[model samples]
Target chain A: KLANVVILATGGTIAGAGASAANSATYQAAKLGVDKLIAGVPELADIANVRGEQVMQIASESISNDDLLKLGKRVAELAESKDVDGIVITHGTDTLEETAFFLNLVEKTDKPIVVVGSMRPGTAMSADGMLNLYNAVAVASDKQSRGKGVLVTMNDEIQSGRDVSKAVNIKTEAFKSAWGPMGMVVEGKSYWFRLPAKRHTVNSEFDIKQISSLPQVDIAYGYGNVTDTAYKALAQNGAKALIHAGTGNGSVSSRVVPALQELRKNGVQIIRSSHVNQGGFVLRNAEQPDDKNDWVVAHDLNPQKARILAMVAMTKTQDSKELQRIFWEY
Target chain B: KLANVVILATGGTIAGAGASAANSATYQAAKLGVDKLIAGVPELADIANVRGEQVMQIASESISNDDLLKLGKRVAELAESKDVDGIVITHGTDTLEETAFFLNLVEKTDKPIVVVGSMRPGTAMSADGMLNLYNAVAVASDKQSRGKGVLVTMNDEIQSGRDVSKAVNIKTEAFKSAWGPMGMVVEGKSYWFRLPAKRHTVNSEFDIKQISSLPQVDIAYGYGNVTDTAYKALAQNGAKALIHAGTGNGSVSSRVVPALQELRKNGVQIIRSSHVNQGGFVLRNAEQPDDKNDWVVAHDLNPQKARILAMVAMTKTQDSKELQRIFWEY
Candidate 1:
């Protein structure tokens, strides 16, 4: 018997239409409806009892915190339903990692939840949406994908949502993870290599059902001659916590150090993260004095993903120690 | 006759000393002199005519732009010397990539310049500094290492300075390049696999001899609910250029778009680079309207590297097209 897979389409390049076949790079996203997308990939029916829902119609770059909450709630509801065995989210590649990470932290289920998007539009030459969608559905329906955390199936590689990021822009092999992909889905079958060590799904302390609204957490990039202007501005603009996207092992600049310390003193949480491409392993007190400043360190999470985790973690506790603990666990 | 390799020591964990062998993670950096470092690595003598010079002794995190200029000048002087064949820099791991990249851009020489560092102190158990320095010297002395850009010899892997970053903290294999290692150095011999495609050293237009003072450039990170506060503050604080460490696809948020446009109108150059871990391929007119806004996109450069290039490029031209060309070429 085929498992039931529900693909909740939120407009992206997969449903996008270019003026001509040559207009791969130039196109308006969120054009086609969910019905058309499903009808186009008729082979999905052969693997699973597939269904589609128009969750929202917007480019993922414009996806707001409210949209994330709405999407998370829908995915959670579907996961709990007896009819739905797995869930697939058709998202824009722009912020697909952010949404996938948000769901990975909050959604409480063991069933596979795959988030996927294509670099080129459906109308483009050598369109990848059909095959990508097919692989996503195949992975979502597989029993082996359960409890592997939120998965991102892009370019046939199944990547952990927590680890993966939309690395390259405008390429079929755009999505990448630091620790490498978890597995690969080839010709409608999933192959496994590694598993996520972080807490997620059923094991996660966070639940989307309890999260009403996400708190604002902004990131400030660090570099040579970096200032505290952005850090201070973020705090003033109602950011409960600030992610210091520090350079090289999350090292805070001397000029920005005092400002971050003051921000912590003024009741804003300062979490240090690395903007280093490829994975950044920022241990507490490696670059900055985290213990002395009462700050938190984003061990492995990138700045954007750290923002998601910080927002979700801040909902439960304002304690920096507790926040640090959450950063390590998740 | 062996090639003469000048080992310039800029204090880091490689020259650090722990209280005990067990205290690998906790140690004081820049404790040992360049002579001591060279003396500790006796195997380097077998590969090259290695000599030590103490350029500066400080943790890499605290290394300033002035220090970069000083070191670059020294490297250039040594490269021009008749006796010098190659140069090896012993630097702190914290800002190793930045200094290596800075040298790669400014120093107009084909002489092999290998920057080496260790995660653990020389006094600690399984101290990696000796072997790393040996590999650096080995790579520096080899004829094949010339014109391959600045190299980072860490954990036996030879990585391009432009692409390699200190991704992990407190580990032997901490340094990584998204494109993979150019080659590996095994037992005082370098094994070639690939070469860097980016322009550097002899091929670069920016020369250290011509550059006296580096222009003040800053980076502002972008994430959910990001504001233009930092961007405005950076420009106000005499930043000639601003590197927008944007989210996936170098996408700028709607909330911060107006501020960036205003900044651009006010004569501050806005360059978009992704904060995505691994690598980011940010194209012009992808997520944001670069051509409409007259803004530039950092093709493959991360935020910090983008800052380096922006500063170097700004020294020559303020035009966004020329900056974009410099970005694409280098």
Candidate 2:
């Protein structure tokens, strides 16, 4: 009977405020909502029936994309309510891994959502947003955090919003995830070892009620004398796709590969992503010429969540060869 | 003198071979050279006076930049020879962190140079390049690996070629380091737990023979509807600087911050790197505005080693507040 969780607070710095209790990087952001963050987490009421909302307060570097599709359609309308069983959020660790990878590719539900954030400022002095909002409701009322897709839960770890990111800004173990951490939550127990063999939510094919927006993908940065002016100005401003971010395994530097293969001959669509943060593998004809410039290689996806899977894989397909099988199945 | 070390061998797949021994990812990449890779490693006669050098056999994705300035001026002329004391290279982990951060900013010796590679193939069956070239000649004939900078040695850890990479393409624990690993070598000892407070090799000031080239810095990729067409084709093709590998703290979107602030009003020099792989912290006015667009923020670098510290701090200052204080002291 301890599984009907909900929590969704949007304001960050975990409803930040500071100026006292030891200013953790100055503060202000949203300043407490979600009903005083569920009445200051009374241990999230011994673990469930938590329910709180205030879905948009701000600070997460101004979260948008229409606030990630209005919080992915209110987390798919409370995961098709039957009076819900799990879901947290409490975001704002500067773009919490792009809203936990855009609700892990439109999560329909396996229940657990998780998210959580807070590098100090629930009024500092060791403030970690109340034991990380009580371990995001103990990893969203565990059941092994269900299908294991969206989870982010901080400090005590848990991660995998398709390979977590936020890698340290002010620390409290800032996010991280490069083939490690697909688990950890202790004391409230949740463990998990590994399970992200790619794709996400309800085995994702993306469906927040057949999308409403998303597709204009853009991310191009790879050093060493780079040129091609933002892949030809994001394919002449309208950008259907482009993401080079190369270097080491994502290589691409021969003077910006003929202006990114002439923006795929003006039909725009290129992906090679890897600003080499960790665990990357952009190979495909090894570095470029994805079979004569048909390019798409974000293998271990990291380039702002490979632009949220090339904006939900260009809403279905614009072919960079079917988005390299959606960059290898999610 | 047993301390005289020098190996070099530029090929990879650790002098490959396969077609058997349980072929690890098929094989044949610069198969054997450098005198049959030290006569198939008879434990390099107790680790020292080991001289090999076949310096250019290719494959490390064709290691260029004139093979990282002719292997960084042959490791600073074998660290000012005197019958050399330490130096190992063996490479090919596909661009070994850009030739170990271009020999950690032009090595002038604190001795040991390390590098090493191999994710199997040395005739497979668990061949991790013969104990990773015997832990890179036991961390280049230890002595606390000289000045703890250009070391890499695999599997038994011991990173920091300006903070490691190759997080996996085929494991043997594909070298890592996002904020951890500045030590480990075991069985040949070395230990160390931390040490790398930025600037490398004798507190570096870079000096690959007073620079001969390397000022074409590029790295532009940050997702979620990013654009500005490869940041205006990398400052209209003459790119002096640009590394907006943003997304999370390094974030840059909003239809491309006025074309990266008009390439800093046409003088180009914007470093905000982070394609978030592991520990990235690109903050300066936290995600764009970077101090009124003076830009320059790869704090915890991860944009291909922040384009190798913006090509050696743009060969000594292009001043964006002296390249943000040389990205905070290297």
Candidate 3:
């Protein structure tokens, strides 16, 4: 086999079994474990060494930040072991994106850290875990994918964690890079178009060695009828930064103005970000002033992603101006 | 006065206010009509002869299919009317996108129908209504904006109705054009770098007058742990065609397979749209047999927006193959 990659099958819902294949979605997580999950996905043999890493398995949403750190650090260790050329992390989609984005900002390694998960259990009639796992292996093994950052391969879409997120409530192909995915990995082969160059791991200032805990982040919203109480709650809580999920161009209701201003005056960072999902950015000095009032903007990252960015940015610098600059650049 | 055009102020929250300016998010719908509101923005006089149309004053969410038909027909009438050179429709942002897509699907006149709204009532400090209204007026009056379909001008972003959607619940600038705004009206000048040419009104089948009512459509999201209830519910509720907001390459969840397959057998149309918003698309017969399932693919239309196209496409025909053909053409 031309494969020089290792598929670390850290299983969860992807391997769970129920009374029937028809009840796959109803299956419990961490049931069959990684070994059985890897055994079922023989197609992965075409792409890599396909080793099983029975890491702590849980449903995607149940994954904690600590779990992410553990996975990322372990992947780094495995990548350095020389026994593995590339690593694939089989995860639950719940926090799959959070893991991907976390690893993208930490673990300074070029060897691919591709995350794979399933919308269906492997036992299902048309289960997708096999192909998702296969593509992740293919991407992790591909030499060209080095330094491109962590990836998520599912539903035939090859997406970078910094740009992609879980968009839908259900389905195998739920992750989306709102701007666009770089390319695809089809039938164990990669198809390429563009590249990602940003403040990713090895390129970020927040070194994992210096930081053990992520900064706390809070998000608020701008709405037509938003009560000032909501802003008041976030402000009074001494949130390090409040990500304003603004309506149009990061608009907050007039009702919340005083509270937000008060919060900003009290040293609470206010970041303007789009509530809309697809694509957008706050226009400078047009819709809202990011430079004048010294408020930060979320750039093109969605609100959830911005929250992640804010937490990570806090680890590197605390300056609101620098944070907004990071928002503009990344 | 070189007032070359006029902005038709349709009563929406943009013109709304409460007992005080600080009462920004509080106001009864259609409480303050358009004429009284325009008098507040005398700065508009310097730009154009802004008029008022108090047209069926209602919250955007309150707008109905009948309202859409009436507004679409009204906008088209105004677009061709010799008396009005350019037009703007001040709307609430709540259902702004649905209206934009509806207008884009129906209205054929090459004149601008710039939809404007506010996340905040005009009384707040960082008010979005004024700038949005001003921008709409600027975009509407500009000669270069004539052929660009219905547009949503908000938070200083000018987006094509076909792709833009509301992303968040709050923020003044929440609307975004995912692929990128078709153009930006900077200081009343249209700055465009790209031109989209698929199936624009001036190039497609059926005239504006042919569309009387939108063909009904519903999108069912595909997901893990999802039940077949939605497929059955939409089918029972008289959805002419169903767009599956599929995960990854427009993948279908296992729980709903039998239902979707049965739905297909019963002649209900199933379309595959990626829940992963940024990639090209999952081709049929690659992993699953969409061809065998008699399902179609909704190329890149966000499933919600695809529902709009499917509704219009259904107006012309119900043949699944023909619908797919039309989907690609558009």
Candidate 4:
């Protein structure tokens, strides 16, 4: 018997509909329903016992904290089902990485959870959604994809959800990880290369079943001539944690330093991340004095991902040291 | 006679000193002067007629707009000198990419401009500064490096300054370009592979000779739950333009969209850029409607680089359409 793979459609460019075949860049996302999407890709039936479900349908850019929690609870529910062997989510490219990373951290499952999206709509010429959906089902049903944390299938590559980001727009090969992809998927076969080193999924301390509501966390960017307005404003607006998306090794600007130090003193957690286009490896006490300031470093996590971890970690502990340990471990 | 290469030391870990050979990550940066650094690297004599100048002795993270203007003016002056065949800048790894990119855009010269830095101090074992500086001088003197735009030599790789960033921290292979390094250097010889497609140096519309002062341009980051407090504050603080360091495809959050629209109507330029780690290729009307909103997108430039370009471009024109055209051209 073939493995049972469930396709969870949450809506994105993969489900988008354009006015014409040439209107790839101009289209309305979340236009197609799940049953329509599953029927369009008939080849998925060859690899697995496929079923489709329409979750919420909205452009991922507009996905809210409640939306994330809703989706995470459903993914957990499906993972516990005896009939489901693997799960694949069709998400919008805008916040696909965020959702994939959230699932990677919260969902306690060894079964493969692959999040897939496309750059062009199905109505566009040389559309990639058909093949991308086909590959997602293939990877979902495959046993080799188990325990790789949440995965992303894009441009024929199986990327670690913890590492991949939508780096480019209007290109078929948009999703990329700082470290190379974990493997490649071609012709319904999976090829392996590397494994993710970060803790995720079954080994993660976070569980969607336990988290009913996420705390308020925000991110402030750093650049030359940067001011402390965002950092203070965020803390004043009921932010429990603020992620500093600093420049170059997560170096905080002098103008923002006093405000951040003041925020730390006032019991607001501060985490430093880098906005460098390539992955930023921010070490403790490298750019800013994390020890003296009693602040936490984001290590390699970008601002948005840092926000995700901060929210999840703060649900259990508000101590800065505990937060720092959680930042490093996860 | 050998190529006359002038090594301008602006102070970084390359000119740093540690307490012991083991104190690599812990050290006092900008401790040594230019003559001392040149004296430590005697093998540079075999490659070119190298001379050293102490431009400034401070860490790069604290470097201000005046520092960038000073460095750019000095670089332009040296490029026009008949005796100076090439120029080399020894800088801190923190903001090296920013300085190199600023030079790439403003210094209208064909002579090779190589920016180099080290992850480890010379006091550390197997220090990278010596070899990195050697490679910088070698590339600077070579004719093949001319007109290829500003370059950075680190980890034996020659990277286009326009494309390079301090991606990783506390490692030998710290610097990287998202598109990949242009070439490599082995045993003091430069190897060539690619050239940058962007407008730089002689082709760039902005020039250092004419730009006496730079306008203040600030960047505000985006993520889930992001507010427009920073944008409003920065504008009130006299920022001529505000760079929206957006999420995937430069998608502006709904929470901050109205503020941006109001700000644009009030004469603040809203330029959207991606904070994605790998290179972000943001397009005109992909996520948010740029045409309807009358906004600009930073095509492949990250938030920090976008800030640099905005300042340089604003020095000429304050019109949004002209700003959009500059964003595409440069």
Instruction: Give residue A293's error in model 4 in angstroms.
Output: 1.8
The parts of candidate 3 lying over 4 Å away from their true place are: A1-88, A91-164, A167-275, A278-330, B1-12, B18-31, B278-288
lDDT of 2 by residue, B234-301 (tens): 66767777776665567665667888887887888888875555654665774355777788887877
- C-alpha DockQ of every model: 0.44, 0.14, 0.07, 0.46
**Which is superior by TM-score, 2 or 4?**
4
Better of 3 and 4 by lDDT: 4
> What are the clashing pairs of model 1?
A221-B221, A277-B278, A278-B277, A278-B278
Q: What ordering of candidates by lDDT runs from best to worst?
A: 4, 1, 2, 3
- What i-RMS does every model get? 2.6, 11.7, 10.8, 2.4
| Model 3 agreement with the true structure over A58-170: per-residue lDDT tens digits | 65533445665666667777777767777788876655666677778776777788888887777777888888877888888898788888888888978988878777534
- Can you rank all candidates by DockQ, best first? 4, 1, 2, 3
Error of 1 at A59 (Å): 2.2
| Candidate 4: segments with Cα more than 4 A from true spot | A191-197, A277-280, B277-280
Model 4, C-alpha of A100: deviation from truth (Å): 1.4
* Local accuracy of candidate 4 as per-residue lDDT tens digits, A205-269: 99999999999998888765577877887787788999988766778767778998999999899
Q: TM-scores for all candidates?
A: 0.92, 0.34, 0.58, 0.93
**Which candidate, 3 or 4, has the higher TM-score?**
4
Instruction: Tell me the TM-score for chain B of model 1.
Output: 0.98
Weakest 10 consecutive residues of candidate 4 chain A by summed lDDT:
A274-283
lDDT of predicted model 2: 0.76
Name the better of 1 and 2 by TM-score: 1
